[PDB]
Structures are given as C-alpha cells and as structure tokens.
Design a protein around this ligand. Sequence first.
Ligand SMILES: CO[C@H](C[C@H](CCCCNCc1ccc(F)cc1)C(=O)NO)c1ccc(F)cc1
Ligand SMILES: [Zn+2]
Length: 512
Amino acid sequence: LSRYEKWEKIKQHYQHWSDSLSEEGRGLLKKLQIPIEPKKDDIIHSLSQEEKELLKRIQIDSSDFLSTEEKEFLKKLQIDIRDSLSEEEKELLNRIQVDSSNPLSEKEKEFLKKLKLDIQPYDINQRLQDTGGLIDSPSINLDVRKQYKRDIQNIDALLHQSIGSTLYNKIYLYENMNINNLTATLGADLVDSTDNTKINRGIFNEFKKNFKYSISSNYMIVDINERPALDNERLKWRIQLSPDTRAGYLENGKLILQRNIGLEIKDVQIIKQSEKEYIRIDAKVVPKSKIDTKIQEAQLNINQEWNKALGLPKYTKLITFNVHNRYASNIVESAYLILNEWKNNIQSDLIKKVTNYLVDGNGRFVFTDITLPNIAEQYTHQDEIYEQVHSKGLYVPESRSILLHGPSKGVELRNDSEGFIHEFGHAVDDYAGYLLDKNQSDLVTNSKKFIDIFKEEGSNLTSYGRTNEAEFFAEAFRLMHSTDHAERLKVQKNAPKTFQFINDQIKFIINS
Ligand SMILES: CO[C@H](C[C@H](CCCCNCc1ccc(F)cc1)C(=O)NO)c1ccc(F)cc1
Ligand SMILES: [Zn+2]
C-alpha cells in the first residue's frame, strides 16, 4: 500500500494481540530479538593466573574447532586480558600472526576446548538455526537446553495469530541479509573486487543456479517496509506470506514470523538501489512439509544414482541431507556436484573399496546446513562438548561418516569438493589401518613408518597439514587429487615420501 498505511494496517491487525501480551511474553520476545551475552568480567575472574597468561598469547584464529561466534567472543575476551600490558607487547603479540599461523599447542587446545563451554550467549534464534530445530541435540549444557525448550514452546504459543486472508496478498515483507549467512564460499567473491558497487556475474549465476527453496528453522524477523542496505547486506529478500502464516507485530514496523517456515524462491535478480547492485530474492511462504518432501525425494534420487555408480545395493542409505536452513536447495543440489568431482578425481576402485568399508559400518555422507556438533554422526560418539567440533567438514571413524557443512568455507580450500576429498582422505587412512591388522584397528597414520614421514615432511605442504599425522595425510591426499595438476606435482616434489606412502596405501586398499 502506502508504506505507512501498510504498517498501520498490520499493526491494527495485531493490536489486540500486542496489548494482550503478558510481562512474561514481552520479555521472551525481547530476549529473542536481543540475546544476552556471557559476562566477560566473570569469565576472566574464573581463570587461574596461568590460564590468563595462556589466553593472552593464544592465536585464536589458529584453532580448528571453534565456531565463528566462539572465536569472535574469545577475541573480545582476549582484548581485556591484554589491556593491562603495554604497547610493544600489545603491538608485538599482534603482528607475528603473519607466517606464524602455527597449530595450537596441546596445552592451548585443551584450555580452549573447555573454555568454549563458558562463552555461549543465550540466543534462541541462533540455537534454532544451529540445530535446525533439533533442540534436544546434546551440544550445550542440559539445563540450558531445557530453558531453550521452555522458551521456544512459549514463543510458539504466543505466535498464534495468522496474517489472514485479507492482508496476505496485499503486502510484501522484507529481510536484508549478508550473503555470508547463506554461503561463505560464494560470499567471498560475490562483490566485484575492483568496484564495490557491482556484483560479479559469474558468482551471481553460481549463487542462484540451484536456489529454489529455503527453510527457516528459527523465527524470521522481517521489516514491514524495505530498509536500505547496510554495507554488508547485499541480499534483499522480498517475501509473500501465506494466509495461515502465524506472526506477531514488533515495534518499529516489524513482524516476527512463526518458526518452521518453508519458502519457495520465485525470482532472483540483480537490482540497483542508489547506484549499487543488490540481489533481490523474491520468496513465497509455503508449508514446510512441502519443502521437506522435495528434500526427501532428492535424498532418494541421489542414493539411487550413487548406489548404482558405486555398485552398492539399491536400498543402501549412504547419502543423507540434514537440511534445515535458508539456502536449503543449494545444500541438496551441490551434493551431486561434490560427489561428481570426487568420482572424477579419485581412482574408481579406491572410491568403491573405501565406500564399501564405510557402508559395512553403517557410514554416511552427511551434507548439512546445521552446525556439526548437532549432527548425530558426530555427537553420538563425542559425548563431551569440549571434544565436539564445528568445522567445514569432519570424518568420524566411530560412525564411519563424512560430514560436510555447506554454509561455511575452509580457509585453505577453494570449494566444497576439496573439503569432501579431505574427509575422504581420513576415510582412506582409516581403511588402510584396518587392513594392516583387522584385529586391533588403528589408523595407518599412527604407524611408526608414517610418524617418521610426518616428522620429516609435515611442514612441506599446507599450513593446516602441519597439525598432526592424520591431517597431514588428509591434506596430502586432497592435494594429490586436485583438479590443479600443479598441486598434485607439489606433493610429489615437496613431500615425496608422503606421495609414495599414500600411493602404496592406495594399492593395498584396491588389492584387498
Ligand atoms: C574440511 O575441514 C577441514 C578442517 C577440519 C577440522 C576439524 C578438526 C577435528 N579433528 C578431530 C575430530 C575428528 C572427528 C570428530 F568427530 C571430532 C573431532 C578437519 O580437519 N576435518 O577433517 C579443513 C581442511 C583443509 C582446509 F584447508 C580447511 C579446513
Ligand atoms: Zn581433517
């Protein structure tokens, strides 16, 4: 309508609802909009002096297991502990994170792994997104888990009034979004590197190609009137609700939408607003069940394809889509591309032999847009939260499963297929070790032979490869199967013993 007429009409529709909210209800909605942060002063006070000194000098961005949120908080914490010091110390501890980008020491690792338990904000919307609504996932303290459930049940009950049959087709709602919240990989290159006012057309095509549906597991907070973008908001969603979509009015002309929303992507276009290019995303709300049907149909389809390609029984459940968030369709469709690259770049007998071993152990290839600590193939086997990891990908020997987190980007990885191939490197290590001694099953990278190889060559490849024997093996494996011939040649030239060792293990596997 008129922008303000639309605002006043929606506010009127929800006025009784708004006036009727209890103090409890208003408090929940406030909490949801603005999460409570952990107390930095209290965290620091709880540390021993040695722990304080340890935290002062830790290279947080060298950790391999923290979420972005955990890292950013620890950085803010670190500023405070350092502030008693002085400028040289301050300036020094603070620019040999150049080539120094060393793996953390075991002492630094163990400290940070426990400390992360104490830095979680109480954030209902983040909890729903990280878990994809699987709020019983044992990735946070049980008592906090219970509070989240109570709050979420209560918010669900608050949001009982639908937008209705009168307004739904007379209004659009809006959401600005950082592309990095859907895909950090494409986000890195979305904007033209020489001219910030422009979108890279190739990356744009990649972004929209398989973007057909979207899920909100958390509560969307949408603008009644479109807000001009902040510098990092290059996505401008324009959303049409369904008559049955439940919502509540929020001050300053917003709506909070019910959680567990499905959205069909109707159109994706580059538009200009004030001499800058943005991506318009036109989306229509549909029942979430309609979207889940599409994901389940895709899961059946991709397994039917890959079971045949790999010579597995047709009914094998190998590939799983654990998909719950706003770039949903791309998580699904990109899995086909990732597996194609895997098959293209690795010998067929190797892929078949290793995958059969995984399947023999009820293993899965899990493609997901929820955080890895909330994937059962991890948490069923890492019962300590301090040992749970978020990362671009993981290999869990106990579940013989490869996990791949779609929305994030691995630092030294160009794409999702390189991450998957890295994890498959761990699977190779596992199966090769299993063959060595089927009775006491260990990784081949734990052999004295490879330990000696790592001690000699472990710094000769990637920075991340330095971490330990297993990561070195996986990194060497990935680089040996790169689409870039120069990278394959680098392993052969700079880590020749590792190159030989891996090829020898590949033969052992294929010949078993
Ligand atoms: C794809 O992601 C990796 C990093 C990622 C870091 C995870 C570290 C966890 N390792 C211990 C572990 C294992 C299984 C568990 F269940 C729990 C804990 C990884 O190495 N995956 O294999 C990556 C590799 C190369 C790169 F350049 C960037 C990231
Ligand atoms: Zn790894």
